[PDB]
Amino acid sequence: EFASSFGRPQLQTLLKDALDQKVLDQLAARYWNRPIEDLSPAPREPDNIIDLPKADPDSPYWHRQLDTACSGLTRLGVGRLAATVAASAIQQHVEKLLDKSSFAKHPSARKVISDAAATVLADRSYATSDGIEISLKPYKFDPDIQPNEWAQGREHVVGVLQAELEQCQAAMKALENSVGGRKKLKEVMSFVDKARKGEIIVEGDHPSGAGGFSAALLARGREAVFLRDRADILSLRIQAAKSRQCKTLTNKYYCPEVFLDAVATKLAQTAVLFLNVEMLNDFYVRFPREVEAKLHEHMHAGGGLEKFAREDPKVRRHLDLIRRKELLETVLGKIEELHRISSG
Amino acid sequence: IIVEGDHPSGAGGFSAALLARGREAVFLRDRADILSLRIQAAKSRQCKT
Amino acid sequence: MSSKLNETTEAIQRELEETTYQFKVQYNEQPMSAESYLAASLDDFKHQFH
């Protein structure tokens, strides 16, 4: 029943999920803002994302940024990530099915079945990884994007991105409520802002009290300033992805989000095809055999058949009761036959 | 209310310097009250003898 | 030395595999040499100049 459920699309959405967070990490580390660790002035970068829509089309920065972002994405361990992600998914399904199966008891037999699944996946792991990288070799050089793919990227990016924003906006508001007044949190934010500008200097690596704020309040403050900048950037980048400018595929350097997500869905499906073949059918065919052979060898070699029977209390008695009634019967048989071999 | 003293400048919803100016003010208050009670007593009828 | 010799031999074969794996994922195994790079950039320039 389970194997009749799994197939390949589940792998598709499995791969696309890790690859999705890879996109976010790449996209964040190439475009958005970096976190605030201390209270020193940050040196002012020349290029900013707010001015991304209205930028010269042939900008070596924004070009270098989207190009290093995509090649950083593609020259990743996609083969070994598809291999481990599918492995952990199959093995996790098997452990569940086992939890609900009649092997809830008998933990040695159960461990025999789990370890069989694991040893199958771990034997087949290499060929699947390296195979997937080799089949991806053409798409690493030219992941050429079709307008349909560009559309699918566009509809995804809006979902993925606003998901990033809601977790952001809740936690700002949760902050204000936890620190006290919205105005008091505005106060430490004005103070962190002041300190991040030249208006005021603090010169501490770990500042305990400045302007009447605790070490806890300075941390809540920087936290607040990081949340605010990345909240605004995220909405803006959602409005970018819903703009007319990103509907078309021609402004690829102006819509890093849609593009990176397109490359992620493509590499996901082509690596997935190989994955299912090399690895999934390998499981469905090696698993039942390995399960039976290790169970049999384990039962007959280690004598754990007898312990498998001794393990459940109800069958311990059932087998005990049957053997006792059998022994008395055979006894009475020997008595009556003894009277038979000797008349008196 | 209790707080620890890694940062004695800033506690509560009151600012660093406001805390400071409040502590001076309380010392001033206590020492004034005692000083004035002690003057009114030094001038009392019970100190005459 | 000799006792360590075999465990060292095995680790060495491994690090040779991984070195190959990154030589596969990030460079596609494109072999490179200094005089090669020099020859190709020279020729791209002489194309430019042509």
Side-chain angles (χ1 to χ4, degrees), chain A residues 185-307:
Chain A
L185 183 140
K186 225 141 199 185
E187 288 178 6
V188 64
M189 288 192 299
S190 161
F191 181 90
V192 169
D193 274 340
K194 271 156 162 174
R196 208 109 152 298
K197 295 196 256 175
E199 295 189 63
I200 189 70
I201 75 165
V202 333
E203 209 234 335
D205 305 358
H206 301 88
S208 189
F213 305 175
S214 51
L217 255 181
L218 278 309
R220 275 61 183 263
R222 310 196 307 280
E223 273 174 336
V225 176
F226 167 66
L227 291 177
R228 159 168 67 96
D229 309 356
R230 173 80 54 102
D232 306 328
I233 293 171
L234 270 168
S235 59
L236 233 294
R237 285 328 294 173
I238 293 169
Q239 179 179 46
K242 303 185 159 191
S243 181
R244 172 189 291 101
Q245 87 158 143
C246 272
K247 227 183 183 191
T248 190
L249 164 283
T250 61
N251 297 312
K252 136 194 160 74
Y253 295 92
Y254 276 170
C255 322
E257 289 85 19
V258 185
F259 179 86
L260 288 191
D261 200 314
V263 165
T265 297
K266 182 181 299 206
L267 292 169
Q269 76 207 348
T270 158
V272 123
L273 216 86
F274 196 88
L275 216 184
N276 157 256
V277 167
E278 186 82 34
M279 183 171 279
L280 198 75
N281 269 252
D282 195 287
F283 193 81
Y284 290 152
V285 301
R286 280 190 187 172
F287 189 47
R289 291 176 185 271
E290 193 56 30
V291 156
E292 285 180 299
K294 280 292 188 175
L295 269 194
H296 176 118
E297 196 186 49
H298 167 61
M299 295 314 187
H300 295 346
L305 177 272
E306 286 123 345
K307 152 74 175 20

Side-chain angles (χ1 to χ4, degrees), chain A residues 75-77 80 130 133 137, chain C residues 18 21 24-26 28:
Chain A
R75 272 80 204 263
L76 94 84
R80 308 240 267 248
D130 206 73
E133 287 290 337
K137 184 159 204 177
Chain C
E18 253 298 321
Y21 162 83
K24 287 161 82 181
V25 52
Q26 324 183 310
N28 306 17

Side-chain angles (χ1 to χ4, degrees), chain A residues 149-163:
Chain A
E149 293 163 2
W150 181 262
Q152 270 182 18
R154 184 177 185 260
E155 259 205 7
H156 210 212
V157 160
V158 170
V160 165
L161 240 48
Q162 190 136 14

Side-chain angles (χ1 to χ4, degrees), chain C residues 13-31:
Chain C
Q13 304 200 271
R14 278 300 169 293
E15 51 193 38
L16 179 66
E17 300 165 12
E18 253 298 321
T19 290
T20 312
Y21 162 83
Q22 300 282 342
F23 190 37
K24 287 161 82 181
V25 52
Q26 324 183 310
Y27 299 117
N28 306 17
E29 291 192 292
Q30 175 192 357

